[PDB]
């Protein structure tokens, strides 16, 4: 039993809700919140910009030190950093950005990072400003993630389409 509330169950291990991941994280304080990161951990917009804003830019400060030490992530890769006031940890995961020409096959590799964590609050990878089809992102999630994932979908219209079209 966990604290996540109001989710629709899609499969044994995947759950979905129309919610602002920022507000959801502040309420649940999950062990892991997933950020829709880029390789430079520049949290300018989309989910990343919103999460970072909610940390009063502390996420960005921590991320800049991480990059200065380690260099950029790989597309499809991840790193674990602090969750600040939102969660114990933030798993920064880089899905491919279609608006940069990146291989959509890397979306499966991106979701594989979730399997290193028993329970996660997460957005749909590569959705939104990353330009991929969110219906496809959900399919890859369900077919790749084996740990317990609670998906927050900000847009109500998109949430209803995701549910109504789910196989
Ligand atoms: O809707 C989505 O979940 C995907 C993307 N948004 C985000 O990734 C996002 N951004 C900020 N806070 C969030 N909390 C949870 N997801 C959040 C998006 C896609 C299509 C349309 Br249309 C409008 C937005």
From Swiss-Prot:
Summary of activators and inhibitors of this protein: Inhibited in vitro by GRL-0617.
Membrane topology: Multi-pass membrane protein
Domain Macro as annotated: residue spans: 1-167
Consequence recorded when altering residue 31 to A: In strain: Mu/B.1.621
Entry superkingdom: Viruses
Catalytic activity line of the entry: Thiol-dependent hydrolysis of ester, thioester, amide, peptide and isopeptide bonds formed by the C-terminal Gly of ubiquitin (a 76-residue protein attached to proteins as an intracellular targeting signal)
Compartments in which it is found: Host endoplasmic reticulum membrane
Functional summary from the UniProt entry: Responsible for the cleavages located at the N-terminus of the replicase polyprotein. Participates together with nsp4 in the assembly of virally-induced cytoplasmic double-membrane vesicles necessary for viral replication. Antagonizes innate immune induction of type I interferon by blocking the phosphorylation, dimerization and subsequent nuclear translocation of host IRF3. Also prevents host NF-kappa-B signaling. In addition, PL-PRO possesses a deubiquitinating/deISGylating activity and processes both 'Lys-48'- and 'Lys-63'-linked polyubiquitin chains from cellular substrates.
Subunit structure: May form homohexamers. Interacts with N protein.
Name of the protein: Papain-like protease nsp3
Species whose genome carries this gene: Severe acute respiratory syndrome coronavirus 2 (2019-nCoV)
């Amino acid at each position: 039993v966990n604290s996540f509330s109001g989710y629709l169950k899609l499969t044994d291990n995947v759950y979905i809700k129309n919610a602002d991941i920022v507000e959801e994280a502040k309420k649940v304080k999950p062990t892991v919140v997933v950020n829709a990161a880029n390789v430079y951990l520049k949290h300018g917009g989309g989910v990343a910009g919103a999460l970072n804003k909610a940390t009063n830019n502390a996420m960005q400060v921590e991320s800049d030190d991480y990059i200065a030490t380690n260099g950029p992530l790989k597309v499809g890769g991840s790193c674990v950093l602090s969750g600040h006031n939102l969660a114990k940890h933030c798993l920064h995961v880089v899905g491919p950005n279609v608006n940069k020409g990146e291989d959509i096959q890397l979306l499966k590799s991106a979701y594989e990072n979730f399997n290193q964590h028993e329970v996660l609050l997460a957005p749909l990878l590569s959705a939104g400003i990353f330009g991929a089809d969110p219906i496809h992102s959900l399919r890859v999630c369900v077919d790749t993630v084996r740990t317990n994932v609670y998906l927050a979908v900000f847009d109500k219209n998109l949430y209803d389409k995701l549910v109504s079209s789910f196989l």
